[PDB]
Amino acid sequence: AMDLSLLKALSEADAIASSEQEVRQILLEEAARLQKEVRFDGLGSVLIRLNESTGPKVMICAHMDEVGFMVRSISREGAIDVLPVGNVRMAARQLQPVRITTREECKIPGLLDGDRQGNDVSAMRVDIGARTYDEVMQAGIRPGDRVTFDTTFQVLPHQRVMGKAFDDRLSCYLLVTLLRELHDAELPAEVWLVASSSEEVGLRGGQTATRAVSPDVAIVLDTACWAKNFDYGAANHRQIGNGPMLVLSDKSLIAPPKLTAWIETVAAEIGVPLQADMFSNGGTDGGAVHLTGTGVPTLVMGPATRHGHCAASIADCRDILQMEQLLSALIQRLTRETVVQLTDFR
Amino acid sequence: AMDLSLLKALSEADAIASSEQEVRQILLEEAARLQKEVRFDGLGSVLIRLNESTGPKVMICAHMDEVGFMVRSISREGAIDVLPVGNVRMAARQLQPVRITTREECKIPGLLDGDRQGNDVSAMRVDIGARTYDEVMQAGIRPGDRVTFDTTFQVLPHQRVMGKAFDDRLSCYLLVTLLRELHDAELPAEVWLVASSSEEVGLRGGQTATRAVSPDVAIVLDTACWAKNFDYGAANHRQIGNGPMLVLSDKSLIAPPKLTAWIETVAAEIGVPLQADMFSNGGTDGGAVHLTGTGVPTLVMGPATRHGHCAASIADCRDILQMEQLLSALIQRLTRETVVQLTDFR
Amino acid sequence: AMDLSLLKALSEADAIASSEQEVRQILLEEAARLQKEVRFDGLGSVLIRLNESTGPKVMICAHMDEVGFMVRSISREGAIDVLPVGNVRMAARQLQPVRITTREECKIPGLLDGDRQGNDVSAMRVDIGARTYDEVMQAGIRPGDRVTFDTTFQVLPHQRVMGKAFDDRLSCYLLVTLLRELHDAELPAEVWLVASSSEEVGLRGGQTATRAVSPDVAIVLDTACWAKNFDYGAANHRQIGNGPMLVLSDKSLIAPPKLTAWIETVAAEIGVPLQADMFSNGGTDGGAVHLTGTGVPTLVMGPATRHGHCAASIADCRDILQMEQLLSALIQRLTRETVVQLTDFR
Ligand SMILES: [Zn+2]
Ligand SMILES: [Zn+2]
Ligand SMILES: [Zn+2]
Ligand SMILES: [Zn+2]
């Protein structure tokens, strides 16, 4: 079963690096309802201790922030200059409905447009219909205000879903349903569920949250899409409906073969199909995470999406439920001896 | 003397980020034979304690991984899509003999080819003569398999050598011969010989291994070649036969003048000529290493090579022997008072 | 069965136009062991009379030479300038392992590199690690020395093989196995097996050897590959595993319909599938051969390969065995009345 109102709430929440209160508050409400202790790092990353165990520490990590824009400047004509926060697709920077969230938490709708030069779109502005600097000031808008795509979460035919911020609200969704499923479970590992701050602008909350937790093993949840959307050939290992992705490599991390092989054997036991994927361009917080302290065995997993870093992505509900199932099964098998065996280089 | 069978074993070993077992086992055999304690970081970096001393901690660091490719995908026709691991030269991605190592450690030879567009070569595929997907599966080949240049180590005239992975197997070679020479020596410093994991893909095993060791001083061993191979002019400071290189700067590190001055005085005492070099394009272990904790006085040194990040590099045996001699002499002189003198900013 | 040691010997032999002694000696050893008469043309082409017959003269022709390079010049720095011999692929002229054979028959390994400008790669140099002119002289290297790809012959999965010079060492291989099989056979034709000199540089040994033999009919054995390697569509008629190629046309020859029809009927009788192919870009022995004297009915056949004129090609052993079988069957059926029928224009 999908909780579509939770997925709607997370998708529609407006949260960028350093202003993630809308996502944080959802997570905090879930933890408080289940009487779970919440800790924070210096950046505001949410650290939820699932349980108490003398077994190995496992961190399951998602990012709270989405790609968007930030108010930079207001012109005398009431044009709102913005800069991108994260890698917003160049093709998603022209004539796009957006909304601006002010310090008083008011939301003002607008149309974003930019100048195109070849590949690149820069000099972006948001139009709220204002004719003066003062009209914008009156709406409560200020430099630093977050700007996000103006997308309503929607259900698609055949149990697929569409909305903004699936990178990485799908994984925030998974953190919550893991918490709901496993809050009273007897587990062989101590599990920390981490929603890290500010991933889209680099590798920020990932680093600090990992240090605060100090896991023995880490699972980073992120998503990705194939550039050629309707190419269902053997080269596309990011096809929605074909099961969770197991990321073998990205620019920041090459997954450890022992951990990869173990997860594959668990997925095969429980009947979850896996897509083994490699990122040619992208980075995840997998990179910063594994390089913490003296090194953490880490891999990246997640459901595939179509499109990404734009007004809307598409995901398949079965993929999401299967990731939930695989994560739970992995957690239930992560014994001290298992994690020792997966880190023995002799 | 040169141990050519050792250099052959190291050069011909196939080891990329996260799959360095072929090099690690060679290192482990050397340490065991000399009854030396071996530790690991979380990434599998090999940490060899040479001795016990109350003097300063000295780390000598080389990397285990080589540039290569990784199996990404297998088409219905039996084409094996691969992605580069590390910066493989663009001119080394077309019609190159390679071999793939499977999870069962079988080695399947193949021909790599890529699609050239201008400077760039991408969409790389390996051909093993297969006609179907299932033929490749039957050979044991899977996504994630390491792919390396199919190069046999060879002796050249006038005591020079040619083979793959000289970056950084020449430096792994140096770690071993230092271990063989100094295993029973009385030394003013506690020496750690570190073969770090995953350097070609970033600041990876270097960072974590340095933290595990916490040295007072670090020498990072790496190699480089001059782009204009037969220009023996004054601007080429990477000429084979002209002595070990002392790297004054690279993208990731500017060596401390106090440390470089000291090394220069030791080399002049023992009659080892040095080439002072600056990297305009490249980075090293050096960058990650010196930024560890509150900062480690660090420099980069090593034998020059011709060519690099391709099927074969060329090195001069005299250069290698002189580096070995300079490393031993530095270690014998690294007293507590020396390393305090070289770190005094007052 | 395949004689892999023979194919290895032929593939690994280093032989270019005017220096084909390594292949010629292999051929001479086979003929002597079977007490067969060997003649030469003025270029050194090897002419083997299989038998004595009053029937029509049949020539079966392969070429001895491979594409490679030739030492042109040695600089004061010990760089060895080379020029290509034959059409070496442009994508096979950069960072390629090679070896140089001197007049004393020593083999010095090296790395070839070239200067790319657009499509073209020129100003090729070989590096043997030398630092001076005199170092190269001391190694025995001189202008005129042959330079070949440094490729070891290798077995691939599913009974396929990989090595250099498959163009045209696969066909030299076929000459030898035909000689071994048919040395004592009673035949309706007088068969001449010809390994011609210097094909890669023009219409060279083909022309002169044909004149020395004056055949009534000629089969020229050569190989080709399809530019788009993994396109197994209907337009690729050079797929390994799909049977020997019958060349309907190339730049230098349009095969006689009467001859191609006959061969097609023989192949269908014995169950050998054929791929009918047309060269849009290439020429062969076929062109020079058919224009000899008052004209010789001639066609080109051979096993397909993948890749060509580079460090390594791939071939399918079944294709090679089927060509051997088709050649033997053609020879056994080539009666005086057959070859008169196939040349009657009235
Ligand atoms: Zn993202
Ligand atoms: Zn993400
Ligand atoms: Zn390198
Ligand atoms: Zn290196």
Ligand SMILES: [Zn+2]
């Ligand atoms: Zn040819």
Ligand SMILES: [Zn+2]
């Ligand atoms: Zn040919």
